[PDB]
Write an enzyme that holds these catalytic residues in place. Structure first.
Site, PDB file in Angstrom:
ATOM      1  N   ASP A  33     -28.860  33.634 -19.184  1.00  0.00           N
ATOM      2  CA  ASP A  33     -29.968  32.678 -19.318  1.00  0.00           C
ATOM      3  C   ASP A  33     -31.013  32.844 -18.202  1.00  0.00           C
ATOM      4  OD1 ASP A  33     -31.160  30.605 -20.897  1.00  0.00           O
ATOM      5  OD2 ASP A  33     -30.578  29.131 -19.383  1.00  0.00           O
ATOM      6  N   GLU A  59     -30.176  38.495 -21.810  1.00  0.00           N
ATOM      7  CA  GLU A  59     -31.189  37.481 -21.538  1.00  0.00           C
ATOM      8  C   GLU A  59     -31.575  37.460 -20.055  1.00  0.00           C
ATOM      9  OE1 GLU A  59     -30.567  33.823 -23.996  1.00  0.00           O
ATOM     10  OE2 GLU A  59     -31.566  32.843 -22.310  1.00  0.00           O
ATOM     11  N   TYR A 134     -28.548  41.894 -27.069  1.00  0.00           N
ATOM     12  CA  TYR A 134     -28.985  40.509 -27.183  1.00  0.00           C
ATOM     13  C   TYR A 134     -29.700  40.406 -28.523  1.00  0.00           C
ATOM     14  CZ  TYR A 134     -31.392  36.084 -26.079  1.00  0.00           C
ATOM     15  OH  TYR A 134     -31.865  34.795 -26.091  1.00  0.00           O
ATOM     16  N   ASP A 173     -24.307  39.081 -26.777  1.00  0.00           N
ATOM     17  CA  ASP A 173     -24.615  37.849 -27.472  1.00  0.00           C
ATOM     18  C   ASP A 173     -25.163  38.247 -28.825  1.00  0.00           C
ATOM     19  OD1 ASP A 173     -25.662  35.470 -28.488  1.00  0.00           O
ATOM     20  OD2 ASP A 173     -26.883  35.056 -26.703  1.00  0.00           O
ATOM     21  N   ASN A 175     -25.511  36.245 -31.350  1.00  0.00           N
ATOM     22  CA  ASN A 175     -26.251  35.117 -31.932  1.00  0.00           C
ATOM     23  C   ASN A 175     -25.787  34.727 -33.330  1.00  0.00           C
ATOM     24  OD1 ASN A 175     -28.163  33.446 -30.523  1.00  0.00           O
ATOM     25  ND2 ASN A 175     -29.338  35.285 -30.038  1.00  0.00           N
ATOM     26  N   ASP A 246     -20.521  35.337 -28.351  1.00  0.00           N
ATOM     27  CA  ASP A 246     -20.386  36.531 -27.519  1.00  0.00           C
ATOM     28  C   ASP A 246     -19.101  37.246 -27.887  1.00  0.00           C
ATOM     29  OD1 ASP A 246     -21.733  34.188 -25.673  1.00  0.00           O
ATOM     30  OD2 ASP A 246     -22.679  36.128 -25.343  1.00  0.00           O
ATOM     31  N   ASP A 271     -25.585  28.798 -19.757  1.00  0.00           N
ATOM     32  CA  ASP A 271     -25.092  28.011 -20.892  1.00  0.00           C
ATOM     33  C   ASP A 271     -24.075  28.799 -21.724  1.00  0.00           C
ATOM     34  OD1 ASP A 271     -27.133  29.656 -21.803  1.00  0.00           O
ATOM     35  OD2 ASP A 271     -28.155  28.117 -22.971  1.00  0.00           O
ATOM     36  N   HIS A 272     -23.918  30.084 -21.399  1.00  0.00           N
ATOM     37  CA  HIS A 272     -22.798  30.883 -21.894  1.00  0.00           C
ATOM     38  C   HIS A 272     -21.825  31.131 -20.777  1.00  0.00           C
ATOM     39  CE1 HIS A 272     -24.904  32.695 -25.611  1.00  0.00           C
ATOM     40  NE2 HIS A 272     -25.868  31.992 -24.998  1.00  0.00           N
TER      41      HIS A 272
HETATM   42 MG   LIG Z   1     -30.929  31.003 -22.786  1.00  0.00          MG
END
Ligand SMILES: [Mg+2]
Length: 281
Positions: A33, A59, A134, A173, A175, A246, A271-272
């Site tokens: 993040d 990210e 990502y 990630d 998503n 992830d 946040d991950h």
């Molecule tokens: Mg983020």
């Protein structure tokens, strides 16, 4: 409002393969993040504890030209490679940091449409190829879902090509929470980015076509409440209202080398949380 805490305790690290062979490779993957935000939130503390052979970051929001000086505090990961959007701005971005230099590093998936946002690093080693990604989010109101479907197809075709030459490890990630077991609230998220039927189907298509196995789910097929992302909002992490976004996906030929696939639930910085793979290569 309808969810309280659900417990998850990641099992102990299994560091030997089915053959008894000790792990020879440890890969840690983490959506940070934003690299600077992550450093400020003590993200490097986990990296030092984990001591992986390879660290993959998603990210980063950073180009190779604007990296923070703190990344020098990882002298055991001296070979560092970075991809960022072509427009040279602070969003998306991936990094790969390694104990040993790969035989070759490439960026993107060989398709101009999909290579402008700094989303993919390909690192070829002796016995395998590592890809970190990502994957584009489908966006608020699903405004980017059509694009995500195009991405999914192009990415699948690209990975199938790589896997035809060397065994593949894909991490990052992606998503998407593949199945209902992969998020706390499947019922209320079927029209939200990360759990649309289109995204789930894409993930299923990827596993079948390449082919690839979901390392975590292979080892723990029936284990619920195992997530890697929680919204910063509304006590989501404390309640374990999360999503598994992830992954480490592996060529079938690498399954006998699979020791464990970990979720470092308690590691802060983003946040991950980090995920960690042990392979006996
Ligand atoms: Mg983020």
């Amino acid at each position: 409002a309808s969810e309280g805490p659900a417990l998850y305790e990641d099992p102990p690290d299994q560091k030997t393969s089915p053959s008894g062979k000790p792990a020879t490779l440890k890969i840690c993957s983490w959506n940070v993040d934003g690299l600077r935000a992550w450093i400020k939130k003590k993200g490097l503390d986990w990296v030092k504890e984990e001591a992986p052979d390879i660290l993959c970051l998603q990210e980063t929001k950073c180009s190779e030209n604007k990296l923070p000086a703190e990344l020098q505090e990882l002298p055991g990961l001296s070979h560092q490679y970075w991809s960022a959007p072509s427009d040279k701005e602070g969003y998306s971005g991936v990094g790969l940091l390694s104990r040993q230099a790969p035989l070759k590093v490439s960026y993107g998936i060989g398709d101009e449409e999909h290579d402008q946002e700094g989303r993919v690093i390909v690192a070829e080693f002796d016995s395998f190829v590592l890809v970190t990604a990502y994957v584009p989010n489908a966006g608020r109101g699903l405004v980017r879902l059509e694009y995500r479907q195009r991405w999914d197809e192009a990415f699948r075709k690209f990975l199938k090509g790589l896997a035809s030459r060397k065994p593949l490890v894909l991490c990052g990630d992606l998503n998407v929470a593949h199945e209902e077991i992969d998020l706390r609230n499947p019922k209320g998220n079927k029209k939200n980015a990360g759990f649309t039927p289109q995204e789930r189907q894409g993930f299923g298509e990827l596993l079948q076509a390449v082919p690839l196995a979901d390392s975590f789910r292979h080892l723990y097929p029936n284990t619920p409440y195992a997530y890697t992302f929680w919204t910063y909002m509304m006590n989501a992490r404390s309640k374990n209202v999360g999503w598994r976004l992830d992954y480490f996906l592996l060529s079938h030929s690498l399954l006998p080398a699979l020791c464990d696939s970990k979720i470092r639930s308690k590691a802060l910085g983003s946040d991950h949380c980090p995920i960690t793979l042990y392979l006996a290569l």
